[PDB]
Design a protein around this ligand. Structure first.
Ligand SMILES: *[C@@H]1O[C@@H](C)[C@@H](O)[C@@H](O[C@@H]2O[C@H](CO)[C@@H](O)[C@H](O)[C@H]2O)[C@@H]1O
Ligand SMILES: *[C@@H]1O[C@@H](C)[C@@H](O)[C@@H](O[C@@H]2O[C@H](CO)[C@@H](O)[C@H](O)[C@H]2O)[C@@H]1O
Ligand SMILES: *[C@@H]1O[C@@H](C)[C@@H](O)[C@@H](O[C@@H]2O[C@H](CO)[C@@H](O)[C@H](O)[C@H]2O)[C@@H]1O
Ligand SMILES: *[C@H]1O[C@H](CO)[C@@H](O)[C@H](O)[C@@H]1O
Ligand SMILES: *[C@H]1O[C@H](CO)[C@@H](O)[C@H](O)[C@@H]1O
Ligand SMILES: *[C@H]1O[C@H](CO)[C@@H](O)[C@H](O)[C@@H]1O
Ligand SMILES: *[C@H]1O[C@H](CO)[C@@H](O)[C@H](O)[C@@H]1O
Ligand SMILES: *[C@H]1O[C@H](CO)[C@@H](O)[C@H](O)[C@@H]1O
Ligand SMILES: *[C@H]1O[C@H](CO)[C@@H](O)[C@H](O)[C@@H]1O
Ligand SMILES: *[C@H]1O[C@H](CO)[C@@H](O)[C@H](O)[C@@H]1O
Ligand SMILES: *[C@H]1O[C@H](CO)[C@@H](O)[C@H](O)[C@@H]1O
Length: 234
């Protein structure tokens, strides 16, 4: 039966390279054992060399991306007029099966436990948020698993309580004139300053914290001349 006669067998890919033409017998084509033949463009290029096992193909992908699996690789008997090792005809296949492990551990998600009690409201006046929480330990997840859903729920709470307004000091008033025009006399020269607790005034309705500290300041007046000695004659 005539066949397509190719001048080269690639071997790296099992392709029939360099077509010499068709309409010639297999015996004539394979006078040169370096040539090769196939039937039409259907494929399966067989070299004219004596039959010999090809190379083991690369390992197929593991049957599962999880835990232990199994992967194959093939090797084809290629040639003409004879047999490969195994009482094998040209064209047959030989397989090797191997235990593979893409990932050594398969994630199994867990289950939620009971909901924890609702925490109190996040604030004691005006409005805040209320939160309850649970654990992912019934059962606990294995590997990188995780329970389905959220581990905590939150929701708004209204305290029905007007917030108290706290007081803060207004700006400092002006300095008073000094108590004296000189230092060294009966009373040292002192300066005074005062401020109001009106920015903002506290409480309003519920009690508010009063303004912290003092509403006044005292200091010595510096830079004054010395008073004369009014106790004996100079
Ligand atoms: C390859 O990657 C892994 C991380 C998994 O997602 C594989 O899918 C499958 O996941 C389920 C869990 O629901 C396991 O029980 C399966 O055995 C695993 O094949 C994925 O194909
Ligand atoms: C809880 O009880 C209420 C009656 C208030 O006294 C709360 O104090 C206020 O809390 C708010 C917001 O958390 C602050 O802005 C106020 O300054 C503070 O007085 C209290 O926590
Ligand atoms: C204010 O101006 C000063 C320059 C002085 O003339 C002062 O007089 C002195 O005041 C002190 C007490 O602060 C008295 O002891 C002295 O008798 C007096 O000379 C002035 O008051
Ligand atoms: C397959 O197996 C071994 C190692 O891969 C070698 O004999 C040769 O590569 C064969 O094709
Ligand atoms: C399978 O085995 C190793 C890698 O696991 C390599 O020789 C090659 O990738 C083959 O397909
Ligand atoms: C936790 O959440 C719900 C039940 O509240 C379910 O999706 C499941 O039981 C999960 O473990
Ligand atoms: C928490 O929420 C409700 C009860 O409040 C139920 O779905 C279940 O008990 C969960 O643990
Ligand atoms: C919070 O909500 C109610 C009480 O307001 C109850 O179902 C339970 O105490 C939950 O933790
Ligand atoms: C006034 O006093 C101090 C600042 O000096 C603080 O307690 C606060 O700012 C108050 O209003
Ligand atoms: C009074 O004193 C100083 C200077 O003015 C500042 O701390 C602030 O203005 C306060 O009211
Ligand atoms: C008192 O001191 C000086 C005035 O000499 C100014 O910084 C300000 O008026 C303050 O109240």
């Amino acid at each position: 039966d005539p066949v397509l006669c190719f001048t080269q067998y690639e071997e790296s890919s099992g392709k029939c390279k360099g077509l010499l033409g068709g309409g010639v017998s297999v015996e004539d084509c394979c006078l040169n054992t370096a040539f090769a033949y196939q039937k039409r463009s259907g494929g399966l290029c067989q070299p004219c060399r004596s039959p010999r096992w090809s190379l083991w193909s690369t390992w197929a992908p593991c049957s599962v991306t999880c835990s232990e699996g199994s992967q194959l690789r093939y090797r084809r008997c290629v040639g003409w007029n004879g047999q490969c090792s195994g009482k094998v005809a040209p064209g047959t296949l030989e397989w090797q099966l191997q235990a593979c492990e893409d990932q050594q551990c398969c994630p199994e998600m867990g289950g939620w436990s009971g909901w924890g009690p609702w925490e109190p409201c996040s604030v004691t006046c005006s409005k805040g948020t209320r939160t309850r929480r649970r654990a992912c330990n019934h059962p606990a997840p294995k590997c990188g698993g995780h329970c389905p859903g959220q581990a905590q729920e939150s929701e708004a709470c209204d305290t029905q309580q007007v917030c108290p307004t706290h007081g803060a000091w207004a700006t400092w008033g002006p300095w008073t004139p000094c108590s004296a025009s000189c230092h060294g006399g009966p009373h040292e020269p002192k300066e005074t300053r005062s401020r109001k607790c009106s920015a903002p005034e506290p409480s309003q309705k519920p009690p508010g914290k009063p303004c912290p500290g003092l509403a006044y300041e005292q200091r010595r007046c510096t830079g004054l001349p010395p008073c004369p000695e009014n106790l004996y004659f100079q």
